[PDB]
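Job type: complex structure
Entries:
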Amino acid sequence: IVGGRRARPHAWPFMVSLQLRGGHFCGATLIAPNFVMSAAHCVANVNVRAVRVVLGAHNLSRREPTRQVFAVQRIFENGYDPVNLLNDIVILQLNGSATINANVQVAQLPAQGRRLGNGVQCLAMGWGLLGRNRGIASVLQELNVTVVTSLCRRSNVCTLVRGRQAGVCFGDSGSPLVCNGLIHGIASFVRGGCASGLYPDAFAPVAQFVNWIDSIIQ
Ligand SMILES: *[C@@H]1O[C@H](CO[C@@H]2O[C@@H](C)[C@@H](O)[C@@H](O)[C@@H]2O)[C@@H](O[C@@H]2O[C@H](CO)[C@@H](O)[C@H](O)[C@H]2NC(C)=O)[C@H](O)[C@H]1NC(C)=O
């Protein structure tokens, strides 16, 4: 997240950090006790058994007894196309079920086919780079964004921060876009580099996949 702010500790208890070699590299969302939802490009070419799924985190730079750490046991995709970044969504089956407490909870999702209009106020978040060569974020970041259709495909939900250069950046892939309490997006791609002020950020449109998601998780 470039141009955002620290989230309050555990303000988004569904927020998930995907990790390799002990380092964060993608976000995800908890959609059931034993399932997380991320971008398909995040796990396309990784050792799935080497990934660790970290729930309940806030400062990746510390030790937090609030964390619950899981492995991945099975992958579910839905026609992902890496050339054009279509259907950029995956479901991760965990090696167990999380404990729902203050700092770990299941997110709410929209109805199948729901499509957001221009100007809807949303919130992006993640542990990705802060921009300006400040490096990767330590504490979870959040950013106020607006839904836009200009320079966006109908196969995405895109967002933009009007008037300044801010947006998602490297490491935010897979993170949720929250609009009115529901998860409508999964971070998929930027254009013109991060925080360009020229192109909106593009999210996989969760609403288009809710029937498929249910069929995985009940
Ligand atoms: C679910 O997975 C977690 C993650 O640990 C990794 O994946 C496991 C399959 C196993 O290979 C671990 O050793 C891997 O590091 C498991 O958490 C680990 O559990 C062991 C034994 O209790 C413990 O010594 C490690 O410190 C734990 N690692 C972390 C990062 O917490 C967990 O036990 C698995 N649960 C089930 C039911 O399989």
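Summary: The longest strand covers residues 23-32. The helical segments are 40-43, 210-217.
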